[PDB]
Amino acid sequence: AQNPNCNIMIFHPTKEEFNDFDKYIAYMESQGAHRAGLAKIIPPKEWKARETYDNISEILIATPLQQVASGRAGVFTQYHKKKKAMTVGEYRHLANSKKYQTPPHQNFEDLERKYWKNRIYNSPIYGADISGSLFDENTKQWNLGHLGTIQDLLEKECGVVIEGVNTPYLYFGMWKTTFAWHTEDMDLYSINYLHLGEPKTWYVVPPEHGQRLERLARELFPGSSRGCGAFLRHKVALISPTVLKENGIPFNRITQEAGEFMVTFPYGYHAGFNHGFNCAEAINFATPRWIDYGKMASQCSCGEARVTFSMDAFVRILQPERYDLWKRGQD
Ligand SMILES: O=C(O)c1ccccc1C(=O)O
Ligand SMILES: Nc1[nH]c(N)c2ccccc12
Ligand SMILES: O=C(O)CNC(=O)C(=O)O
Ligand code: NI
Ligand SMILES: [Zn+2]
Q1: Per the record, what are the reactions this protein catalyses?
Q2: Which of 19, 85, 205, 275 could share a disulfide with 198, CB 3.0–4.6 Å?
Q3: Which residues have CB less than 5 Å away from ligand 4 (the ion)?
């Protein structure tokens, strides 16, 4: 079996290899990439997402989120406090202000140390889940707004026709902005392109060991666990690499830089943080191998998770037994 230690693999496709998205994902899996839960793809040197980013300051962040932490440095939750709208230009200026800017540091490791030591004592502001794309329409390869849809994948694989659409989201980050431990909706894949700015550090648990993380999470967040059988779906819980190591949870880490893609694989739990002002674009996608994960995916039914319109059909077709109870949580 390929990649038995479940290491994060890094790929360097040629421009020829970069033409067929599905084929390259299948290739990465043939090499065992999915066992890690996360892979990095460095685009060929000839490729560009768009000409320049010189005209993006006018994008609106309608609902910036202030990420307020509770708990201890290595085990905490964060809640999202809504702030007044601001443009990306305003947000960038805020990110670079003395209050929010990345501190002096020696390297990525020093910055990682500072993040886990000090994150809880600050409340950075994130522009997350903004529907849109920064890929040029003329970019034909790995354009996250031009991928085959999850609905079409389900139809091709299962012969079922369903409602729903599947579009990308933009994420504007600053120092300490954080993504909590989670898998994707329906345990889908995700693909994430870092368009511009400072890096993003990722942590990931191999899909074959996801239940180990869940067990630890139930121990570390006991109230949350009692409230919901799938509380990680709430996307609010953080556990540091030190605490993971102390508890023997298998995981890996890697830092994504501007111009690089990351792919998360079905049921690959991931979390991470931004180093400074940046902009990423991400979307969920599916392959034939996903279908069985979609059938088995946990669901939040306590009402906290609250997911997109399009998830309805996924649950309805792949998890009909769960559908009634799950939908009671949406209404
Ligand atoms: O439902 C699960 O398998 C689960 C179990 C323990 C913690 C969290 C979850 C979750 O899905 O978020
Ligand atoms: N609010 C809340 N619930 C659980 N389980 C927590 C653990 C740590 C910090 C806050 C928490
Ligand atoms: O970039 C972020 O803030 C969060 N991204 C993801 O969880 C993802 O691409 O799957
Ligand atoms: Ni994700
Ligand atoms: Zn819930």
Answers
A1: N(6),N(6),N(6)-trimethyl-L-lysyl(9)-[histone H3] + 2 2-oxoglutarate + 2 O2 = N(6)-methyl-L-lysyl(9)-[histone H3] + 2 formaldehyde + 2 succinate + 2 CO2
A2: 275
A3: 190
Q: Whose CA is nearest to atom 6 of ligand 2?
A: 221
Is 270 annotated as belonging to a binding site? yes
Contacts of 282 (CB under 8 A, 6+ apart): 144, 168, 169, 171, 190, 191, 192, 193
Which of the 8 DSSP states describes residue 121? Answer: G
Centre of ligand 4 from the C-alpha of residue 135, in Å: 20
Atom of ligand 1 nearest to the CA of 215: 6
Q: Is 229 in the pocket of ligand 1 (CB under 6 A)?
A: yes
Q: Whose Cα sits closest to atom 7 in ligand 1? A: 214
Tokens read off for 331: 């209404």
- Identify the residue whose C-alpha is closest to ligand 1 atom 4: 230
d(CA 80, CA 180): 12
> What CATH number is attached to the domain comprising 106?
2.60.120.650
Resolution in A: 1.4
What residue's CA is closest to ligand 1, atom 10?
230
Other CB atoms within 10 Å distance of the CB of residue 139: 18
Q: Is 282 near ligand 3, meaning CB less than 6 Å away?
A: yes
Please list the residues that pair with 172 across neighbouring strands: 127, 279
Closest atom of ligand 1 to 217 CA is 7
Q: Which two tokens stand for residue 284?
A: 């969920």
Q: What is the DSSP string of 71-98?
A: EETTEEEEEEEE---EEHHHHHHHHTST
Is 128:65 a contact under the CB 8 Å cutoff? yes
Residues 6 or more apart in contact with residue 15 via CB below 8 angstroms: 44, 46, 47, 141
Helices 311-318/320-330 angle, 10° precision: 150
Q: What's the sign of the alpha-carbon dihedral 147, 150, 156, 160? A: negative
Question: Both ends of the chain: CA-CA distance in Å?
Answer: 45
Method: X-ray
| Residue-range definition of the domain harbouring residue 322 | 1-331
What ligand is nearest to the CA atom of residue 329? 5
Total count of domains within the chain: 1
